[model samples]
Target: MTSLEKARELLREFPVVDGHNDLPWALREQVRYDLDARDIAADQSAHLHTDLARLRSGGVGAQYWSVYVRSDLPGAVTATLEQIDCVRRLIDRHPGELRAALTAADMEAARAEGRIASLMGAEGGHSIDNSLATLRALYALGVRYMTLTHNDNNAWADSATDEPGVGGLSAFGREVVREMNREGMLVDLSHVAATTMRDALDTSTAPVIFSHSSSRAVCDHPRNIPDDVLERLSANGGMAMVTFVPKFVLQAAVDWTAEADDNMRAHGFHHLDSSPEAMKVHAAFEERVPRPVATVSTVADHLDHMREVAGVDHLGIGGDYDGTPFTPDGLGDVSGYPNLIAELLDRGWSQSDLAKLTWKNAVRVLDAAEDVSRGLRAARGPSNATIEQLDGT
Candidate 1:
């Protein structure tokens, strides 16, 4: 068999659960419906890396559908909740084609059933409004993981991009991590400050996940995690899901000139890190910018670097699709995943290593968090909160 065909064969036998995906945002932007329709999955008019056809071809067994809200959206929590609901509705609409995989069992079962396991993950803690009650409500609504911050800091957590306070989790932020642990939610420290990642690694009882981040040691972007942080995550049994955004991938130096900054502000793209316009703008910029030859590598470079730092067990896939404009040329979309796998194979990665990178590592984290849920549910009993309870109030 050809390399791609061999990779596909491996994928079919092994459940390839991608740790992060932002396809819902593309659906939200391009399609008027609250829920993504099948038609949306077939068209490339939208700037997302995923579509149902692409996913099937790519051998994507499951993906955590990120419920994300741009920083410009007023009431981030409310908007994100609506997006979360939209995914739920979409799964309902498509019956056997897609199934909501909230638990490890659900994921395995969905894959076995030959259905795509569509999971829900909150991309930012801003989606909680810094309210513990809201966090609880989100958990009740089937949110399995919550990134502590996006590109910007919230009332509690500080982001990596900018310095806010000491750049660690705030007093309330520690509480958020603790509560997520007690409530069985996987705490994500992807866009969090360096110290915040350490705090989260120390605080969360469940294994934390860097849902869509890479090695800062490889690229100096604040959004990337450093080696020490990777050590901490490994100690906590967490995984650092690497992103493929060209900006993050290439370590391209950004130029925030006065004129450019003003233009961005005028166009409401100032919050480029977490805005839809950011994707478009970044893509345009990359076409103009020259990429260094040394920076070009298949996705294996990231996986290998992560494995070297965090160990094979703590590395996994987190394609930040629809969240960024540029990606490495060859690995551009969901369909490009097998190409990455083929590279990994060529690079002397054992089948077991590929298994961990694709699914086992994510499954390990999920199982760990689920155990916390089982323990919490045993101790505190079922919660009284429901979607209707909050919406009604």
Candidate 2:
């Protein structure tokens, strides 16, 4: 088959499992409480990353809805719980097309049944109230993975932007990781400090994942995973979901217009979790970035670096669309995923490699986490411990 034709066939054959997305957050901001999938799809007024139509058109077999809680919010625990509920409500409201999935097997079932299997991953550790009970409850609520921290430090773990030694996992944070292991929830180390990432990797018994991170060797950003972490992840049989955010992709040095730096600065917004001011600036800044996209070769560069360090089995795609502005030149939204598939074909990746990147690797890690959870449960029977118990709240 010709390259384009081969890519097309691969796209159809492959189970395109997207690791992370912030569509719920976008729905909160852009939809103004109107999260009806149809409304988000039709109103193109919002320039955020996804909609049901886009996801369907893109051939997305499964996706993890990011339950991101802004770290700076007052009553963060309550706010995060509400956000998680909102996503649950969305899935409940659209059972015909979307269903909450808790396992890789569930995803395959959804695809076979012609449904969009939705999974949840808390994008920030702050969501759990720094409590293992809250973490367990989130898993009960169908949360499959939890990114240890967002852009800032939480009580449990230090963020990349936070102080270094203080940024690593605290004693309570280590407990949280152990609990997550026992619960079969994948621990995601993205957006955390290098030290915290290492602590999490070392502490967790199950395979962990970088739900949406890239190679620091390529981008040189603190948010990106370093070489040693990459090697460790590969050795542990974990995978890094290569992110497409341009700042993370090009690192901060290249200064893409869509990056948080320019986007935040142009609008006078200071941080990722800043209030309406930051949101307002971000909305305006997106206009100047110029889209309709770059090339898969650009993305392949990041994937290549990840493969070089972590090996091919360690990489997968985690498009942080709607969560950030700096997607690569060609990868604009969910619909642009086929472009990536086509690019990979042009680069001469085999069908097996494509399968692993698209789905198998992620599934393998999930299965491993599930196994660990089973073992943990076997060791201890069920208990009714609540989040308050874990954190003296």
Candidate 3:
């Protein structure tokens, strides 16, 4: 078999357990959660980067669908629940292709049954509404992981894109991490400030995950994980799932994206907007100045660095499909995982190493978190700890 075919064969046995995707948000945006209008079972290539067929063709065994709410949106907790419901509905609609997954064991069952294990990850702390009860509620609804922040800092933690608020995890933020551990939820550290990453590392008993981040040393983006933290990942027993966003993976795209953002504000559009009008704004800007496009090798470079720093056992893949406007050239959609695996194979990555990067590492982290939660529960009951009580608000 050719190397690309070899890669596909491997994926057939151990498929990709991608750390993140914003498909729920994409569904919400294009059709306001109308599955009939955006039927992913057919083709959504006109507006979406993911479809049921493309995801299966990509060799994905499991997915963490992002239930992300805008940090600035009012009633963010309500928005997050809606996102969760959307994912649940999608799974129910595509019963054969998609199966709801809550545990690491469930992921394996999906793989065995030739179904994609669909998991949920609440993408910001605001989704919990500053209440542990709401956090537990989200977990009960099958949100397996929770990112500490988005692009903006909240009451207790700092975000990589926003100003340094709370310096890192405040007393309340530490409690949040602690509670997540108790509840068997993976504490995702993506999009958090480096200080928050460190503080969370210090506080949490279970292994954490950078659900969709690349290596900062490779690209110098604050949204990327720093080398020092990468060095710490192995000891913490966590993993870093590198992302495929062009601006995050390619160095040349950094300054280019900043200028693009400036142009967007000049036109009175949100910096991250990808609506039809916003896309037109981007197209117009691209006409004025050439846009930087990243290739599959560009993403592989970060994985090489991330592997060098964090090692094979502490790495995974998290292509942010449907979340970013631009993906790397060969990794343009959910059907691109085999292309990436082929690239890694060409680079002399062993099949065993590829297996860990694509699948085993993620399952290990989730299973470890479950084990830790059992011990924590034995030690104590549910934390009724409030932010005001902990932070002395």
TM-score of each: 0.86, 0.86, 0.96
Q: lDDT tens string, model 2, 230-290?
A: 9997668899998887656663334553364656765555655468777666666556653
Task: Estimate, for each residue in 1-393, the C-alpha lDDT of model 1 and write its tens digit.
Answer: 776787888898775787688767776776744443435345663556777777878788888889988765688877887788778877887675788888888888887899888888898888987577898899889898999888887767788876776458766777778778878789988888988887777677788998888877776678788989887766799899988775665644323333344555666686446567766665565466544422226346667888998999998888887666566766677777888888777778888888888888888899998888678767774444433343332
lDDT of each: 0.76, 0.78, 0.94
Best by lDDT: 3
State how far residue 372 of model 1 sits from its true place (Å): 2.3
- Cα lDDT tens digits, model 3, 61-86, are 99999999899979898899899999
Pairs with steric clashes in candidate 3: none
Off by over 4 Å in 2: 37-46, 165-167, 251-294, 381-393
Candidate 3 RMSD computed on C-alpha atoms after optimal superposition onto the true structure: 2.1
lDDT of 3: 0.94
What does the lDDT read for residue 191 in candidate 2? 88
In model 2, which residue pairs have backbone atoms overlapping below 3 Å?
A: 158-167, 246-326, 293-329, 293-330, 294-329, 294-330
| Candidate 3: regions farther than 4 A off | 262-285
Question: lDDT, candidate 2, residue 2?
Answer: 72
